[PDB]
Design an enzyme around this catalytic site. Structure first.
Site, PDB file in Angstrom:
ATOM      1  N   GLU A  42       5.756   1.486   3.563  1.00  0.00           N
ATOM      2  CA  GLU A  42       4.902   1.671   4.728  1.00  0.00           C
ATOM      3  C   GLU A  42       5.616   1.983   6.038  1.00  0.00           C
ATOM      4  O   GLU A  42       5.413   1.288   7.028  1.00  0.00           O
ATOM      5  CB  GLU A  42       4.022   0.435   4.908  1.00  0.00           C
ATOM      6  CG  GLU A  42       3.276   0.017   3.664  1.00  0.00           C
ATOM      7  CD  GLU A  42       2.536  -1.286   3.842  1.00  0.00           C
ATOM      8  OE1 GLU A  42       2.688  -1.967   4.868  1.00  0.00           O
ATOM      9  OE2 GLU A  42       1.771  -1.637   2.949  1.00  0.00           O
ATOM     10  N   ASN A  48       7.178   4.366  -0.556  1.00  0.00           N
ATOM     11  CA  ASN A  48       5.813   3.943  -0.860  1.00  0.00           C
ATOM     12  C   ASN A  48       4.969   3.781   0.403  1.00  0.00           C
ATOM     13  O   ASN A  48       5.482   3.394   1.455  1.00  0.00           O
ATOM     14  CB  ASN A  48       5.905   2.606  -1.608  1.00  0.00           C
ATOM     15  CG  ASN A  48       4.609   2.186  -2.256  1.00  0.00           C
ATOM     16  OD1 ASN A  48       3.978   2.953  -2.975  1.00  0.00           O
ATOM     17  ND2 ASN A  48       4.232   0.935  -2.048  1.00  0.00           N
ATOM     18  N   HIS A  53      -5.187   1.784  -2.460  1.00  0.00           N
ATOM     19  CA  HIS A  53      -6.062   0.616  -2.312  1.00  0.00           C
ATOM     20  C   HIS A  53      -7.356   1.245  -1.795  1.00  0.00           C
ATOM     21  O   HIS A  53      -7.459   1.591  -0.624  1.00  0.00           O
ATOM     22  CB  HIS A  53      -5.476  -0.370  -1.295  1.00  0.00           C
ATOM     23  CG  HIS A  53      -4.290  -1.131  -1.812  1.00  0.00           C
ATOM     24  ND1 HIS A  53      -4.386  -2.058  -2.823  1.00  0.00           N
ATOM     25  CD2 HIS A  53      -2.990  -1.111  -1.435  1.00  0.00           C
ATOM     26  CE1 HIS A  53      -3.191  -2.586  -3.051  1.00  0.00           C
ATOM     27  NE2 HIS A  53      -2.335  -2.030  -2.224  1.00  0.00           N
ATOM     28  N   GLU A  68      -0.210   0.756  -6.430  1.00  0.00           N
ATOM     29  CA  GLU A  68      -0.931  -0.501  -6.237  1.00  0.00           C
ATOM     30  C   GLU A  68      -2.444  -0.328  -6.266  1.00  0.00           C
ATOM     31  O   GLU A  68      -3.158  -0.791  -5.381  1.00  0.00           O
ATOM     32  CB  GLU A  68      -0.505  -1.083  -4.910  1.00  0.00           C
ATOM     33  CG  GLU A  68       0.979  -1.009  -4.671  1.00  0.00           C
ATOM     34  CD  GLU A  68       1.339  -1.637  -3.338  1.00  0.00           C
ATOM     35  OE1 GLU A  68       0.454  -2.243  -2.708  1.00  0.00           O
ATOM     36  OE2 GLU A  68       2.497  -1.529  -2.924  1.00  0.00           O
ATOM     37  N   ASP A  70      -6.357  -0.554  -6.838  1.00  0.00           N
ATOM     38  CA  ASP A  70      -7.479  -1.484  -6.876  1.00  0.00           C
ATOM     39  C   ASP A  70      -8.600  -0.783  -6.127  1.00  0.00           C
ATOM     40  O   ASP A  70      -8.347  -0.030  -5.187  1.00  0.00           O
ATOM     41  CB  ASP A  70      -7.164  -2.902  -6.363  1.00  0.00           C
ATOM     42  CG  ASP A  70      -6.601  -2.938  -4.962  1.00  0.00           C
ATOM     43  OD1 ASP A  70      -6.847  -2.024  -4.154  1.00  0.00           O
ATOM     44  OD2 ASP A  70      -5.914  -3.932  -4.668  1.00  0.00           O
TER      45      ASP A  70
HETATM   46  O1  LIG Z   1       3.092 -16.529   1.198  1.00  0.00           O
HETATM   47  C1  LIG Z   1       2.912 -15.357   0.423  1.00  0.00           C
HETATM   48  C2  LIG Z   1       1.631 -14.608   0.841  1.00  0.00           C
HETATM   49  O2  LIG Z   1       1.646 -14.360   2.239  1.00  0.00           O
HETATM   50  C3  LIG Z   1       1.675 -13.256   0.085  1.00  0.00           C
HETATM   51  O3  LIG Z   1       0.499 -12.497   0.173  1.00  0.00           O
HETATM   52  C4  LIG Z   1       0.709 -11.200  -0.463  1.00  0.00           C
HETATM   53  C5  LIG Z   1       0.735 -10.053   0.535  1.00  0.00           C
HETATM   54  O4  LIG Z   1       1.211  -8.842  -0.110  1.00  0.00           O
HETATM   55  C6  LIG Z   1       0.418  -8.416  -1.236  1.00  0.00           C
HETATM   56  O5  LIG Z   1       1.125  -7.391  -1.852  1.00  0.00           O
HETATM   57  C7  LIG Z   1       1.191  -6.254  -0.996  1.00  0.00           C
HETATM   58  C8  LIG Z   1      -0.221  -5.569  -0.831  1.00  0.00           C
HETATM   59  O6  LIG Z   1      -0.103  -4.556   0.208  1.00  0.00           O
HETATM   60  C9  LIG Z   1       0.990  -3.669   0.042  1.00  0.00           C
HETATM   61  O7  LIG Z   1       1.021  -2.810   1.131  1.00  0.00           O
HETATM   62  C10 LIG Z   1       2.376  -4.252  -0.260  1.00  0.00           C
HETATM   63  O8  LIG Z   1       3.271  -3.146  -0.472  1.00  0.00           O
HETATM   64  C11 LIG Z   1       2.243  -5.216  -1.497  1.00  0.00           C
HETATM   65  O9  LIG Z   1       3.512  -5.818  -1.757  1.00  0.00           O
HETATM   66  C12 LIG Z   1       0.178  -9.544  -2.226  1.00  0.00           C
HETATM   67  O10 LIG Z   1      -0.764  -9.117  -3.203  1.00  0.00           O
HETATM   68  C13 LIG Z   1      -0.300 -10.860  -1.557  1.00  0.00           C
HETATM   69  O11 LIG Z   1      -0.346 -11.900  -2.534  1.00  0.00           O
HETATM   70  O12 LIG Z   1       1.922 -13.479  -1.306  1.00  0.00           O
HETATM   71  C14 LIG Z   1       1.736 -14.854  -1.705  1.00  0.00           C
HETATM   72  C15 LIG Z   1       2.815 -15.718  -1.067  1.00  0.00           C
HETATM   73  O13 LIG Z   1       4.060 -15.470  -1.715  1.00  0.00           O
END
Ligand SMILES: O[C@@H]1[C@@H](O)[C@H](O[C@@H]2CO[C@@H](O[C@@H]3CO[C@@H](O)[C@H](O)[C@H]3O)[C@H](O)[C@H]2O)OC[C@H]1O
Length: 302
Positions: free
Chosen positions: A132, A173, A210, A238, A240
């Protein structure tokens, strides 16, 4: 576990994988989740264990318990792995973002990349080297990396990754690269064209994907537009979709299927309750860890 594996059917069309995500908690919270991962998906991305905050919480002090587990589970079960993510403005420890000296940040950046990549050298299919780094208008996001080092951080990250593990596919990404003509898509394409012409080793572009309901049909064009950047490959990283309609999911699967550079799709989660967007029921398995209609629709489209 669904009897029919969408990963297997996808691979039958020449694609590398149709995967998902995981980490210690979701891989052990019940019996169905790990069973679904082993039976229906062929690749794994650590949901949080490989991010900066979880790998290097303090300067030069690494914590690899979580990432080790994910890598070991995947390797122990024949699943490809996508490392995620080396350089990102989010989930970044305060010690990094507070650095103001260019040479100090470069040293820190290189040491992080090197240590994390060296630990899993040769076991990673693809690494999301940069995540990002673009604003919605296509300009470069003013993260600490951009602010302190400038645009050269892009070259430094990729060149360092390339030398540390020449076996991994190096990716940039980003999200919102969901329809041709969108400013961020145009910005991703022009920058990558420039970086590749300068010799920066960028093997692929990852499109998070997403989506909201109904946005599936525009993905095919977005992937076609990204293919013009000139990278060897691209991937839906990713996925969804709010509502998880079959029309949306099949449209996205076909988007990748019909684009030569698209090597695979990673769905951001297995079952709805474990989704980071759980309230929208955006995944392929439901609250009971059972295949939803979209899963079957995907299977029958392949
Ligand atoms: O404490 C941690 C939580 O804050 C954390 O939340 C995660 C946030 O990132 C998510 O994955 C991202 C989704 O958006 C994209 O842009 C990123 O590139 C991805 O990595 C993830 O799904 C949430 O769970 O995770 C849990 C604790 O470790």
């Amino acid at each position: 576990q669904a009897s029919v594996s969408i990963d297997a059917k996808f691979k039958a069309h020449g694609k590398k994988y149709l995967g998902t995500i995981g980490d210690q908690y979701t891989l052990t919270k019940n019996t169905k989740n790990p069973a679904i991962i082993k039976a229906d998906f062929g690749q794994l991305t650590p949901e949080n264990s490989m991010k900066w905050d979880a790998t290097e919480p303090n300067r030069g002090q690494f914590t690899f318990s979580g990432s080790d587990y994910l890598v070991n589970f995947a390797q122990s079960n024949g699943k490809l792995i996508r490392g995620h993510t080396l350089v990102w403005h989010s989930q970044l420890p305060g010690w990094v973002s507070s650095i103001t000296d260019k040479n100090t940040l470069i040293s820190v950046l290189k040491n992080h990349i090197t240590t994390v990549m060296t630990r899993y050298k040769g076991k990673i299919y693809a690494w999301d080297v940069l995540n990002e780094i673009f604003n919605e208008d296509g300009s470069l996001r003013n993260s600490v990396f951009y602010n302190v080092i400038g645009e050269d951080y892009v070259r430094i990250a990729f060149e360092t990754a390339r030398s540390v593990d020449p076996n991994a596919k190096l990716y940039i990404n980003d999200y919102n690269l969901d329809s041709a003509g969108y400013s961020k898509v145009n910005g991703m394409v022009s920058h990558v064209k420039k970086w590749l012409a300068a010799g920066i080793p960028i093997d692929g572009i990852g499109s998070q994907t997403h989506l909201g309901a109904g946005a599936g049909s525009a993905v095919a064009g977005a992937l076609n537009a990204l293919a013009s950047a000139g990278t060897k490959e691209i991937a839906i990283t990713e996925l969804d979709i709010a509502g998880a309609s079959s029309t949306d999911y099949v449209n996205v699967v076909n988007a990748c299927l019909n684009q030569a550079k698209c090597v695979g799709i990673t769905v951001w989660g297995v079952a709805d309750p474990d989704s980071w967007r759980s309230s929208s029921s955006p995944l392929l398995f439901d609250g009971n860890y059972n295949p939803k209609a979209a899963y079957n629709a995907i299977a029958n489209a392949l």
